[PDB]
Amino acid sequence: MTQKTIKIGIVGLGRLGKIHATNIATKIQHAKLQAATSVVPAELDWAKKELGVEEVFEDFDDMVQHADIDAVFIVSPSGFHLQQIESALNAGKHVFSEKPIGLDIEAIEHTQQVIAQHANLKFQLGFMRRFDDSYRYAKQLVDQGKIGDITLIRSYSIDPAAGMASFVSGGLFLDMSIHDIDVIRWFTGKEIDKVWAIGLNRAYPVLDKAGELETGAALMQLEDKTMAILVAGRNAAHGYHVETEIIGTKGMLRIAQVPEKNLVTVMNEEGIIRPTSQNFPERFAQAFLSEEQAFVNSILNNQDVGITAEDGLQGTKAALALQEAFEKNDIVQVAS
Amino acid sequence: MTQKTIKIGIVGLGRLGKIHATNIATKIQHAKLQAATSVVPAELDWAKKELGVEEVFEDFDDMVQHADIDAVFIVSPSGFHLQQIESALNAGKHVFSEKPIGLDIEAIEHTQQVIAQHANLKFQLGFMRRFDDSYRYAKQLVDQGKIGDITLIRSYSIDPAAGMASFVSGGLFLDMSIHDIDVIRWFTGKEIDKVWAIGLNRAYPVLDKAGELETGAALMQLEDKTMAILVAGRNAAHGYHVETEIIGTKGMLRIAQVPEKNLVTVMNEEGIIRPTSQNFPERFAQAFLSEEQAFVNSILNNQDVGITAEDGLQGTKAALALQEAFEKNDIVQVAS
Amino acid sequence: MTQKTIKIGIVGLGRLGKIHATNIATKIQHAKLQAATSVVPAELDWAKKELGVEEVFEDFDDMVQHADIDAVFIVSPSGFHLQQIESALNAGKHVFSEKPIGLDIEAIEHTQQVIAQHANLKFQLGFMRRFDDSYRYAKQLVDQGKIGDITLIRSYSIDPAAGMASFVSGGLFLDMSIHDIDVIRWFTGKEIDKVWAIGLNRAYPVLDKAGELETGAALMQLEDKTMAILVAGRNAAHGYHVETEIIGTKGMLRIAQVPEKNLVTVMNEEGIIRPTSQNFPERFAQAFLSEEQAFVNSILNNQDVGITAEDGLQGTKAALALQEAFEKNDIVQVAS
Amino acid sequence: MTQKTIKIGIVGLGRLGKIHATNIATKIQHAKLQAATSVVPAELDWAKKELGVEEVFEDFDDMVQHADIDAVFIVSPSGFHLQQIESALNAGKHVFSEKPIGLDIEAIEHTQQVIAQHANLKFQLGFMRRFDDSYRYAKQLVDQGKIGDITLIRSYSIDPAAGMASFVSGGLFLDMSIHDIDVIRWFTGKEIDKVWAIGLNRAYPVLDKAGELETGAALMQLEDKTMAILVAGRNAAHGYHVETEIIGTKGMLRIAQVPEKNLVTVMNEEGIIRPTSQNFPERFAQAFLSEEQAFVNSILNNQDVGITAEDGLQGTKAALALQEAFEKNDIVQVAS
C-alpha cells in the first residue's frame, strides 16, 4: 500500500535531540527511529531502552554508511552540522538539520554547493517557528494584507533565569537571535542591510571576560528601509520570553506579547496572574512536532518544504554581523 | 455673575462620608462644604481642621433648620436616611442621599410621598456606578444597540478579605448587591420578578449564628424572562471585585472582568501580574466625584439627574426578596 | 515485544465520530482503527478511503461479534449508548463511550450492573475536559490546596451562533451542560443537591414551541452548601465560549475567562483584538487526543482511568433535574 | 486664612493650551485663570466667554508686565518657550512651561542661567508622564528595588493615524520622543551616551521631501551600558500608543502594554476586543491635572517639584542627537 515508513537516524541526544528522538519514535506518522549516533554511551543506552532504537553508532559516518535509514536528523553541536549534512547527502539520505546551518560563511557555501548537487534529496533546517500555530496565524494575516506593508518588526528571545547558572557558545546573537532573524526574513521577504548591537552583563559580569552577554539589543535596517529591533537575553525572571511584534501600515500584531502558559487565570493576593511557559520544549512543543511531520511528509510526497540552505546562510551571516557590531560597538553592513 | 455656589451640609463622617466631604470641599466646582453633622465629636473636629467647615452640628434637624446651606449630603447609617431625607426636604433643602434609600418598604413609600410634594427640590440617590466611566461606556454600547437585546446580566460585588476581621448590617444582599440590582434595572429598563438566593459561610462559620453571610449567589428572572445572576461576598483574596457582564443577542461585554488597578503589567517569577484595585474608594473614585458634581450641577441648572426614589424602592425590595429567598431557601416573588 | 496494538471499532461517524476515528487511525500510539459501523453508506466509504478501515458494518452487534477488535469507541446518538455499551462488554470488548452515558435513569442503572459484571474490561466516558491541559492545571492548583476549599463554581458552555440555523436534542442542559456538571463533581468531590433553572428564547423564539432553549441559566446548591452557577447557550457571537471559574477561600481562578484562539494579539481600528476559538474541535483538540490515548494506555497497562458509570449517571441525573426545574420553573431536588 | 489663590496667565490656546486653561479655570484648587495671551483673536474671545478670563493680551510681555498674575503657563510653539520663560522670570512670575524647554542648545543654556538667577521662583517643565498614576506606580516598584537594576528600557510613542492628514515640526524625535527620553532619565537616573536612529515614510512618502518621518526607531546606549529602545510614529491604526517597558535584573514591567481605554471588554464576531484610548488628552487627562495642581501647590508651599531646566536641556539634546543620527544614518554621541 502507498507511502510506507521513513526510517530515520538521529545524531545528537542532548535535550533537543531527545525531544526530536522521542517525537519521531512515538508521535510522528509514517516514521521509525531506526538509528542513533552519540559519543556518549549513556545516551545510546537511553535510545535503546526508552525508544527501542535498533541500531546505535558512535560515529555519524558509520551510521549513514551502514544503518537501514532513509533520512537523518542532525541535532549535534553547531560545528558539526555542515560536515554531517554533506556526509548524509553523499550517502543518499534526506536531511533535517537543526539551526544554525553552520558557523563559517565559506564552509556554509561549500555545503550549499553539495546540497545543490543533491536536489532529489530533501534538505530542511529546523526553523521551527515557521511551524508554530501562532506564528502561522500571524503570517496568514500578513499574507492576506491585513496589516498592510510591514514597517517594523520587534522580536525578543529571552531564556529563563533558571538556565543562567549552568550557562555561566558562539555568542548571544547566534545562540538566541537566529530564529528571530529568520522570522524577520520570512515575514518580510526582505534582507537585512546593516545593524548595530549593544549589550551588557549587569546581572552576571562574569560573562564579560568569558566573552559572552546576558542581555543584548540591536537595531537593524532592512533593504527597503524596513526597521527591525532585537532583544536577546538569558535572564528572564518570568520564564521563556519569545515574542514577535509586527507593525504594518494598516495595523499591528504581537505573537505572545506575554508567554501565556495556558488558558488559566489565577486571582490571589498578588493580583491577577497568568502563569507563563517556562522553557522552549514547553513553548514550542507543537512546532517541533509539526516540523518533524512536515519533513517526513516532504519525503513521502516528494515536495520541498521551503526552508533552504540560503535561509540558513542568511541567518548565520546576520548573527555574525550583530556579533561584530557588538564587539566593535559600531554599525556593521551584513553583506560585508 | 450667573450660577453661584451651592452650600452643602453633610451628615455622616464615616469612611464614605469623609470621601464625599473631602471631595465637596476641595474638588467639586461651584460648591462649598458649609456644615457637617455627627454624633462623634472627633469627626466634627476633623471637619473643622481638615476641611475648614464653618458650622458643626450634633443633630441633623438642627443643621437643616439653622445652617447656611442649600443642600444636604446624607451619608448616615441606612436606618436614618428616610427621616433625614424628609427633614431636609421639609426645610427646603436639595437632597443627595446614599443608598439604600431606606430599609422598610412602608417607610420608604412614606418618603416617596414627601419627595413628590417637593418636586422643585432635587433628590438624588448615590448609585455611583451610573457615573462610572466604564459603566457609562457599556451603557452607551447597549443604548446604541451594539449587543442587541440583553438576555442575561451577571454581576459580582465581592469585598476584599482585608475587611473580614472587622466585619466579624442588614444582610449580605442589602449590603453588597444593591448597586448590582440598580445596574440591572438601569441597563435593561426591566423589573425583577422572582429570585432564589443561596449562601455559605465556608471561610468564616462564625457568621452563621450572627445571621450573616460571607459569600452568596442568586439567580433572578426578570419580567420578560431576562435572566440575572448575582454573586456577593466579603472575602475576595485579590482585592475589590466588582464586575458586570452583559450578554446580548448580538454580543457580550464585561465591565472589569478583572479589577485592573492601572495600566501596569508586572512580569516576574510568579508569571504575568496585573495589580488590582483594593477597595471601593480606589475603584470608584471617579464615579464619586462625577455623581457629586452632577448633583451640584442639577441644582444650578434646575435639571433632574434621573435617579429617583423609585430606583431606591426597587433596589431595597429586590434585596429584601433575595434575603427572604436565602432564609427560606426557596424562590421568592419580589412583588410579594 | 511487550504491549502490542489495540484494534478499535468505532460506531458513529458524525462530526465528533470522525474526529475520534481520524485521531485513532493517524495519531494515537499503539492503536489501529480496524472497524467502523454506520447506517450511512457514505460514512463507511469515507472510513475506507480516508482512513483505510478494513472492516465496515451496518450493524453494531455485527461489528462487535465478528470484527477483529479489542475495544470499541461509541460515538452514536445518545439513545444508543447504553445498548451498545452492554453489547460490547458482553462480547468481551473494552469500551469508550461518549457522554451522556444514557438518557433514562432506570436504563442507566441496568447498564451500571452490566459494567460491574465485566470489571476486567475498561469502561471510560468521554468527559474530555478532564484531559484538557488548562483544566488539569487548575485541578492541580486545587488539589495542592492553593485556593483552599471551593465555595463556588461558575461554568459556561455557549455554542457559536454559527450553529443556530441548523439547530433550528434532549434539552439545552443535557446537550450543553453535562460537561459542566462533571467538572463541578470532579473539582469538588461533592454532589449536587437542588437546582433552579430558567431560560429564554430571545434571539430565536421558534425554539419555544420546539421545546428547546437558546440560552439558559441555573443556580445549584451542593451537599455542603457549595454553590454552583451554570449558563448554557447556543448563540455566542464571539465563538465557542467554554469557561469555568472556581472561587475558593484563599483565591480564585478562571479557565478560559475568554476563549483565546492562540498567542496572537491584533491591534487595529477596532482596538486590541484577541481572536477566539470557534468550535469544540478546535478548543478541545488536545483533550480529545489525550483521552483517546489514555483509553488505549489503560487497556495496555491494565489500569483504570477513573471516569466511571457513576460519573455518567450523576451527569445525566443533574441535567434531567435542571430540565425539570426549567419546565416547572421551580427548585428541584436532584435525588428525587 | 493661610494660602490664598494663585492667579495664572496662560499663553498658547491651541489644543493643549485650551486643556490647561480649562483645567486651571475649573478644576485646579487654589488657582484662578486670570489672564490669557494669544495672537488669534478668536482664542481670546473663547477664553473670555468659556472661562471668564478677565484680562486678555495680544502680547506675552504685555501680559507679564501688566496682568494681575503670580504665575504663567507657557503653552506657545516651542520656538517661543525660552524667551517667554526669561521674560516671566524677570517680571517676578513663577513659570510652568511645556516641553521642550527650547530648540537651540546655546539658547537653552542662556535660559538656564536666567533660571539660576531666580531661584526663589518656581520653574517646572511639562513632563506630565511623571505625574501619571501608572508611571508613578512603576516608578515606585523600581525605587523599592522590585525589578533590581534596570538593564533596558523600551518606549513607544505613536500618534493615531487620525492625525496624519493634517500632519501632512522640528522632527519626529523632538516631537514624539522627548517624553520618552525624560522617562528614561527619570527611571534610571542615568544619562544617554550614544544613539543610532532610522526611519521610514512607508505609508506616507510625501514626508521624505518635507524632511519628516512617519515612523522611526532608535537604539541608545546609556552611561553604564544600560540599553534603551525608542519607537516614534504618527500612524497608529489602533489609537494613541504610548507604552514603556522596563527590564530589570529581577523582573520586568510594562506601562500600557496596550493602551486600554477603560475596564470594558467587548466580545463579538471579531473576537475579544479591548477599546483603546484615542489621543493624548484622553490618555493623559489625569497627568495634566496632577502636574497643574503640583505647580500651584509648589508655589503655595514653597517646595520645588524636581523637574528642572537640566531635564529640559538633556531632553532636547538627546532628541537632536537622534535627529542627527537619522540624517547621517550613523551613530551619534549625545555629548558632541
TrEMBL record, chains A, B, C, D:
Presence of keyword Chloroplast: no
Pfam family, one: GFO_IDH_MocA
BP GO terms, sorted: NADPH regeneration
Organism: Lacticaseibacillus casei
Gene3D superfamilies: Dihydrodipicolinate Reductase, domain 2 (3.30.360.10), NAD(P)-binding Rossmann-like Domain (3.40.50.720)
Transmembrane segments: none
Family from the record: Belongs to the Gfo/Idh/MocA family.
Domain GFO/IDH/MocA-like oxidoreductase: 135-254
Keywords: Oxidoreductase
GO cellular component: cytoplasm
Ranges of residues in domain Gfo/Idh/MocA-like oxidoreductase N-terminal: 6-121
GO molecular function terms listed in the Swiss-Prot or TrEMBL record: nucleotide binding; oxidoreductase activity
SUPFAM superfamilies (UniProt xref): Glyceraldehyde-3-phosphate dehydrogenase-like, C-terminal domain, NAD(P)-binding Rossmann-fold domains
Superkingdom as given in the UniProt entry: Bacteria
Protein name: Inositol dehydrogenase
